[PDB]
């Protein structure tokens, strides 16, 4: 977006404040550069993020990610971040990708600050072709954030399903990484997901299974842009439901028996479900790293086994 010069923190009233989180005029020299910067939260008390406005060049920027954390990887105005962005746990708040429609429901907030919430936003920008930077122009791309101190009646959170034992032999044509967990919490309303696999991934699917009925949360090619998609039909998860996910993999594309890791030569199977919850009851993070109901995958719908 245009290069400012005015205020990153604009106080809009007694409860609300806006945060313009923008690269400080950057010029990448190679293709597929990863730049990060951080803004300290200017309140030491609970705040709720209630809106995002992407300020992206459609020309230069491929995708952006906003995280919450309390320990940013560097303390510079900007830095290269092909590593983990935050030294502590990075809570993803907002994903934007060039070739994708970006979708919060009314009343939904991400709780930050106070004794427990994130104290820092870290913004990541994926620049694509330096061809747009032939002119040594400076990019100021990023996100505008609406912060309120007013308790929001719905509170956003992230459900992460990952499969932890991931080795596939180099020839095996189809292997399933199956994840399932019993939901033992108060209701979450699922509104968006993100699937992530490496190169041997063909399709990733996530379901709520209640009384034997498979309701689709998401299905996506995990080789397509890595951002969040909107849940076609918003879903609710309740006590007694099973969350089930399946990553379908090959051993025809790589030559050795691939193991887990962060860099791109290992194999992950992750599915990110963004939800919200009533404020009284709301958890900001949940995980599933188990397969508690492996016999129940026997009635998985056929879509989950077909790559599109
Ligand atoms: Cu990208
Ligand atoms: Cu309904
Ligand atoms: Cu990965």
Swiss-Prot record:
Cu(2+) 2 binds at residues 196, 198, 268. Keywords: Calcium, Cleavage on pair of basic residues, Copper, Cytoplasmic vesicle, Disulfide bond, Glycoprotein, Lipid metabolism, Lyase, Membrane, Metal-binding, Monooxygenase, Multifunctional enzyme, Oxidoreductase, Phosphoprotein, Repeat, Secreted, Signal, Sulfation, Transmembrane, Transmembrane helix, Vitamin C, Zinc. Residues 1-308 are annotated as: Peptidylglycine alpha-hydroxylating monooxygenase. In the C-terminal section; belongs to the peptidyl-alpha-hydroxyglycine alpha-amidating lyase family. GO terms for cellular component: cell surface; chromatin; condensed chromosome; extracellular region; extracellular space; neuronal cell body; perikaryon; perinuclear region of cytoplasm. This is Peptidylglycine alpha-amidating monooxygenase. One of its GO terms (biological process) is heart development. Cu(2+) 1 binds at residues 62-63, 126. Changing residue 198 to A: Abolished peptidylglycine alpha-hydroxylating monooxygenase activity. Monomer. Interacts with RASSF9. It comes from Rattus norvegicus (Rat). It is found in: Cytoplasmic vesicle, Secretory vesicle membrane. Bifunctional enzyme that catalyzes amidation of the C-terminus of proteins. Alpha-amidation is present at the C-terminus of many endocrine hormones and neuropeptides and is required for their activity. C-terminal amidation also takes place in response to protein fragmentation triggered by oxidative stress, promoting degradation of amidated protein fragments by the proteasome. Alpha-amidation involves two sequential reactions, both of which are catalyzed by separate catalytic domains of the enzyme. Disulfide bonds join 3-140, 36-81, 69-86, 181-288, 247-269. The keyword Nucleotidyltransferase does not apply. One of its GO terms (molecular function) is peptidylamidoglycolate lyase activity.
């Amino acid at each position: 977006n245009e290069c400012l010069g005015i205020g990153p923190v604009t106080p809009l009233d007694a409860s609300d404040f806006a945060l313009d989180i923008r690269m400080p005029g950057v010029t990448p020299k190679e293709s597929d550069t990863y730049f990060c910067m951080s803004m300290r939260l200017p309140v030491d008390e609970e705040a709720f993020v209630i809106d995002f406005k992407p300020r992206a060049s459609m020309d230069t920027v491929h995708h952006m990610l906003l995280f919450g954390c309390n320990m940013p990887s560097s303390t510079g105005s900007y830095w290269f971040c092909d590593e983990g962005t935050c030294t502590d746990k990075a809570n993803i708040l907002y994903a934007w990708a060039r070739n994708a429609p970006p979708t919060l429901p009314k009343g939904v907030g991400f709780r930050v600050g106070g004794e427990t919430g994130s104290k820092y936003f870290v913004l990541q920008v994926h620049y694509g072709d330096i061809s747009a930077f032939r002119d040594n122009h400076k990019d100021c791309s990023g996100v505008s954030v609406h912060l309120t101190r007013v308790p929001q009646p719905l509170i956003a959170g992230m459900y992460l399903m990952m499969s932890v034992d991931t080795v596939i032999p180099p020839g095996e044509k189809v292997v399933n990484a199956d994840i399932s967990c019993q939901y033992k919490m108060y209701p979450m309303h699922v509104f968006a997901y993100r699937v992530h696999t490496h190169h041997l991934g063909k399709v990733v699917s996530g379901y709520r299974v209640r009384n034997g009925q498979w309701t689709l949360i998401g299905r996506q090619n995990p080789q397509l842009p890595a951002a969040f998609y909107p849940v076609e039909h918003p879903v609710d998860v309740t006590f007694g439901d099973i969350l089930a996910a399946r990553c379908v993999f090959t051993g025809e594309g790589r030559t050795e028996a691939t193991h887990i890791g962060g860099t791109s030569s290992d194999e992950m199977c992750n599915l990110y479900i963004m939800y919200y919850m009533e404020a009284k009851y709301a958890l900001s993070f949940m995980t599933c790293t188990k397969n508690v109901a492996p016999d129940m995958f026997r009635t998985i719908p056929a879509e989950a086994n077909i790559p599109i």
